[PDB]
Every structure is written in structure tokens, then in C-alpha cells.
């Protein structure tokens, strides 16, 4: 996260760290959607241009974390993966269209003050909140700058940007399965997700029922926090039918 702030304790209890066993490193962000399911970006797990193709035993999910590097004894919970499910129409060749994946945990995670699932939106939630100017919140342990690393979880609030403005900022083809967010050069305010924040959640707090909803997944960008550029997010509601199908089994 570039130009964000340290998260407060328990601020994002659905935040998950995807952790590579060997070498021991941060793989990606992710989110807790139930006691057994974790949501992430498909590119965190499968990305042939960079020879990325992780299997279940290559990683661990670390839930309830704040500090990036420390083993948070009696707070964080480390879970193993039973199975990874990548969207069958994930487009890694061109624009990361349908950049979404599910991970089933071997055992259910126990909820605590630091571990709690986020909601997934329904059609009405998405229609009411996914509006240009409406702000969401992005969290992660990724890069503080495009070109170090935070000590603790970072947070940034960013406005959803008009589809034409998103389209006009890039040469990449934008799909209906994506949305973009961030401030304009004329807005003064800054902020963006960056490398290592991938797979993390873009959340919004419904003013109707006061619950947090995951509207997006950190997907891609061209650099980090560049003027006239925006972060791109997987549109969670647009892919909910796939989510439900996988969970229903």
C-alpha cells in the first residue's frame, strides 16, 4: 500500500496473508469469507508469465495478523489448504479478466476479536455502493513504494472512478469484471495498492445495515500511485455466481 496508514488493531479481521513456506515470504493478500473459505486473486496462484503456479502444499494462510513479519503468538491462526479453485475463465494472457480464486481450508478457523469474515455483496448491495465517487478501503502488507516494506498492516481509502476515466487511463482493455479506484491528479489526495497487496480486499461499509462488504479484489495496475493511473480490482458481485457454485460444490 502506497500513501496509506497503519491499520488499527482488529480493523480488518477478514484480512488474510498468503504465505509461501519456502523461501518464507509474503505471497499475497486474501480475505476470510467463512470459517473454511478464503478469497483471493487468481494471479496470486497462477501466473505463467512469471512461472507462478502454486499448489496447496506450497503455502499457508495466516489469519488475524497485524505485524507483517512477526509470529503473532495467541493472536494469529495458521491454516493449511485443502484445495485451490481458480475461475475457469481467468484471463492471465491479456488483462487478468476474472482474476479470482477460492481456497478451502483443511480445518475451520475459530473466530476471535482479530478473526472474523467479511460479507459478500448481493445484487442490491453492489447496485447501491458501486458508484463513482463512493469510497472503499484497501488493506495489505505490500510495497510502500513502487520502487520499503511496512512493519504492520496498511490501510487506504479510495474513491471508485468513472468507467470512461478508468478506460482512458490505460492502453489495456477493461472488462465488466473489473473496476478502478483512486484519486485524480486534481484531487490532491494520494494512495494505491501495490505489489504484495494483490488478492487483498477492497471493502465498503453499507450505510443501510452497517456491515462491511467485499466489493473488490486487488488485481492489477501499471506501477503504483502514479498520477493519472488507477488501481484495478476484480468485481466480486459480477463473479458471485461462480463463487456460490464452488461453495455449493
Amino acid at each position: 500500500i502506497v500513501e496509506g496508514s497503519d491499520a488499527e488493531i482488529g480493523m480488518s479481521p477478514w484480512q488474510v496473508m498468503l504465505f509461501r513456506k519456502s523461501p518464507q515470504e509474503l505471497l499475497c493478500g486474501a480475505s476470510l469469507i467463512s470459517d473454511r473459505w478464503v478469497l483471493t486473486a487468481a494471479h496470486c496462484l497462477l501466473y505463467p508469465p512469471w512461472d507462478k503456479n502454486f499448489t496447496e502444499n506450497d503455502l499457508l494462510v495466516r489469519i488475524g495478523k497485524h505485524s507483517r513479519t512477526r509470529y503473532e503468538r495467541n493472536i494469529e491462526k495458521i491454516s493449511m489448504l485443502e484445495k485451490i479453485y481458480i475461475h475457469p475463465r481467468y484471463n492471465w494472457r491479456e488483462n487478468l479478466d476474472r482474476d479470482i480464486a477460492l481456497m478451502k481450508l483443511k480445518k475451520p478457523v475459530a473466530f476471535s476479536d482479530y478473526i472474523h469474515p467479511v460479507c459478500l455483496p448481493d445484487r442490491e448491495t453492489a447496485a447501491s455502493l458501486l458508484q463513482a465517487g463512493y469510497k472503499g478501503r484497501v488493506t495489505g502488507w505490500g510495497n510502500l513504494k513502487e520502487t520499503g516494506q511496512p512493519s504492520v498492516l496498511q490501510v487506504v481509502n479510495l474513491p471508485i472512478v468513472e468507467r470512461p476515466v478508468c478506460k482512458d487511463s490505460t492502453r489495456i482493455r477493461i472488462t465488466d469484471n473489473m473496476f478502478c479506484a483512486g484519486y485524480k491528479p486534481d484531487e490532491g489526495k494520494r494512495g494505491d495498492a501495490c505489489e504484495g497487496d494483490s488478492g487483498g480486499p477492497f471493502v465498503m461499509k453499507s450505510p443501510f445495515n452497517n456491515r462491511w462488504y467485499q466489493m473488490g479484489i486487488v488485481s492489477w495496475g501499471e506501477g503504483c500511485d502514479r498520477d493519472g493511473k488507477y488501481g484495478f480490482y476484480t468485481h466480486v458481485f459480477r463473479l458471485k455466481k461462480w463463487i456460490q457454485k464452488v461453495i455449493d460444490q
Binding site: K21, Q24, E25, L60, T69, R70, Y71, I78, M80, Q149
Partner: peptide, 10 residues
Amino acid sequence: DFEEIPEEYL
């Protein structure tokens, strides 16, 4: 720079 995690997590 990651602190070692307990052996029980493989």
C-alpha cells in the same frame, strides 16, 4: 526477515 513459525505448521 520473517520470524520462524512453529514446526506444527509444516
